[PDB]
């Protein structure tokens, strides 16, 4: 019954030479019943991306909570928030609710408009932070991802090769996870230009 597995889903992020990639499946279902295949888990505030897994009603609320928050930030500092300055936020945020947590597993990922360096980060429900130079995974097929990433990952891939590696990890774990699938979408984030793509996968 674990609140973090009613709805299902997965998210994964990777870093490459001057870019990052963030990907997720599309399914939202109740227990075994599949309800939707257009449920996206990746949002963005300015040039900062956040993917969220877990209890759907919380995933939605958090997006709204962060949109709200980031808009107020921009207005006050006269600039969009950065990836690190943002991670710190969603961490404190998650924690202010330490004794009635939102049941999620966020994952930030972006590029710093000043330095120009790639960034990816993960957190657990109460907000513990976690940077990594290679990859972040979260979700129901969490283990299947660690297995794929700890094989297919390669430092400094070119954005065109990163797209292939990340896709393949997502694609294959979602096939060994009974509650993740029904489509996927992947993003390739550079300093400028952001390309979004939907992939073709088994619909079972």
């Amino acid at each position: 019954s674990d609140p973090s597995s009613i709805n299902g889903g997965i998210v994964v992020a990777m870093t490459g030479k001057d870019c990052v990639a963030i990907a997720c499946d599309l399914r939202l279902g109740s227990q075994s019943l599949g309800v939707s295949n257009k449920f996206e888990k990746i949002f963005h505030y300015g040039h900062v991306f956040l993917g969220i897994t877990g209890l759907a009603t919380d995933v939605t609320t958090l997006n709204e909570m962060f949109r709200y928050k980031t808009n107020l930030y921009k207005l006050k500092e006269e600039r969009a928030i950065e990836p690190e300055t943002f991670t710190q936020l969603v961490s404190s945020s998650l924690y202010e609710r330490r004794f009635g947590p939102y049941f999620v597993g966020p994952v930030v990922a972006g590029i710093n408009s000043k330095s120009g360096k790639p960034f990816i980060a993960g957190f657990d429900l109460i907000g513990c932070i976690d940077e990594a130079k290679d990859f972040i995974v979260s979700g129901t097929a969490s283990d299947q991802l660690f297995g794929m990433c700890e094989s297919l990952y390669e430092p400094n891939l070119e954005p065109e090769d990163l797209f292939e590696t990340i896709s393949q990890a997502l694609l294959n774990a979602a096939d060994r996870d009974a509650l993740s699938g029904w489509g996927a979408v992947v993003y390739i984030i550079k300093k400028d230009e952001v390309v979004k793509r939907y992939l073709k996968m088994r619909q079972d």
């Binding site: 109740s30 309800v35 257009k38 759907a56 009603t57 939605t60 609320t61």
Partner: protein, 198 residues
């Protein structure tokens, strides 16, 4: 649980909702209307826990109506369902949560497009071409996966929906005492009192 179906077609939404009401061993009624119109072009069906069910429905209805005379403008399907998911969202983490699942189907006179939102008591919202709450889905979802097309006429949808009910009857243990159908579109809401008068 109760029956709650809904399907969006070419230019309108259709809502099906079983008529029976049961308290334990008996059936106190076989002509209950689980619907409740929020505004001229937004309709919302519901099903859930005994008391929670309509206390909530009316509450929502009251807020929308208030907003509508105040602004003298009509709130849109999209924004209406958004408000609902907000409430239910806060509800789940309160001394005692409403256990209510819903379907909202309105006509966006601004885009001239029908829209149907399905929301469960946890605050989980999603826009769909057709939906259902509770066990209602397992018996129908496959038939609709099969025949549904976005170009369908209101006239065609009903015929479809009829099939789903016929299936619900043949394989469902509970006797839901039939359904009541309602249509939402550019001209407002009307009741197909002829799926019952048939």
């Amino acid at each position: 649980m109760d029956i709650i179906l809904g399907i969006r077609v070419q230019d309108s939404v259709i809502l099906a909702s079983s008529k029976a009401v049961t308290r334990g061993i008996s059936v106190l009624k076989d002509s209950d209307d689980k619907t409740r119109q929020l505004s001229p072009h937004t309709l919302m069906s519901f099903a859930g826990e005994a008391g929670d069910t309509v206390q909530f429905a009316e509450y929502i209805q009251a807020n929308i109506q208030l907003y509508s005379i105040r602004e003298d403008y009509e709130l849109s399907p999209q924004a209406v369902s958004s408000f609902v998911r907000q409430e239910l969202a806060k509800s789940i983490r309160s001394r005692r949560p409403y256990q209510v699942n819903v379907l909202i189907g309105g006509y966006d006179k601004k885009k001239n497009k029908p829209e149907l939102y399905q929301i469960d008591y946890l605050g989980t919202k999603v826009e769909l071409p057709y939906g259902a709450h509770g066990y209602s889905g397992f018996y129908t979802f496959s038939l609709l996966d099969h025949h549904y097309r976005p170009d369908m006429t209101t006239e065609e949808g009903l015929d479809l929906l009829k099939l789903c009910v016929q299936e619900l009857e043949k394989r469902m243990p509970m006797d839901f005492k039939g359904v009541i159908v309602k249509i939402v579109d550019k001209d407002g809401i009307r009741q197909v009192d002829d799926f019952q008068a048939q």
